[PDB]
Design a protein around this nucleic acid. Structure first.
Length: 181
DNA sequence: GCGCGTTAGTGTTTACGCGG
DNA sequence: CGCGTAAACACTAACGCGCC
């Protein structure tokens, strides 16, 4: 079934995030308003797919796509997860194969990164929570087949308000020590 | 539909590695 | 130390099974 991604591309840094969020605040980019159905979940997971949803307005606090994910790792201010399956007995790279006893599993190459932003949206300081989910693949990192919002003319009009930029820099995960090259 | 035990998503906490 | 990685752990939403 048919509601789809909020936009298409790849998120690398806060500038990419800011454009997507601003695009959502303006109303050009449509957020997810309800949890996907079981059959809708299978389609979510396509590379380049980006989803944004308001926690309060949608009732979604945790995003579920029905796939198998590794434990969370930190990459800057993002959380990253890796999809894994079990073997047959078709072949895959050695390093991508592991074995949680007793059975043997492998990493597919599909990846998910997440980001949460708490941001004022009227008077007072009641805060709404915006969730961002982005799917991509290792392969798309080599080929560079996915477009970043910040290098995509479509997002240019979504130039971020300073309040958004400030809110984004205030964000941290675990110890604030994660900082990949 | 509802109750209830299990799994999983989202982080925090704690531990590991190393330049110099 | 200061910087950066990465595994362990804790919380509980969300799932899914039984019901028959």
């Amino acid at each position: 079934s048919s509601p789809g991604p909020t936009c298409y591309g790849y998120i690398d840094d806060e500038q990419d995030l800011a454009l997507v969020f601003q695009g959502v605040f303006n109303g050009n980019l449509r957020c997810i308003e309800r949890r996907p159905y079981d059959a809708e979940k299978v389609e979510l997971v396509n590379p380049g797919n980006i989803f944004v949803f308001n926690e309060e307005k949608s009732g979604i606090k945790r995003w579920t796509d029905g796939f198998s994910w590794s434990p969370s790792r930190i990459s800057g201010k993002f959380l990253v997860y890796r999809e894994y399956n079990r073997l047959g007995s078709h072949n895959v790279p050695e390093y991508n194969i592991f074995e949680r006893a007793h059975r043997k599993y492998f990493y597919t190459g599909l990846l998910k990164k997440t980001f949460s932003l708490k941001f004022n949206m009227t008077d007072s300081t009641k805060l709404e929570t915006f969730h961002l989910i982005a799917y991509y693949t290792e392969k798309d990192i080599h080929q560079g087949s996915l477009r970043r919002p910040s290098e995509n003319p479509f997002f240019h009009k979504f130039r971020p308000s300073q309040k958004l930029l400030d809110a984004l820099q205030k964000v941290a995960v675990g110890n604030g020590r994660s900082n990949p090259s």
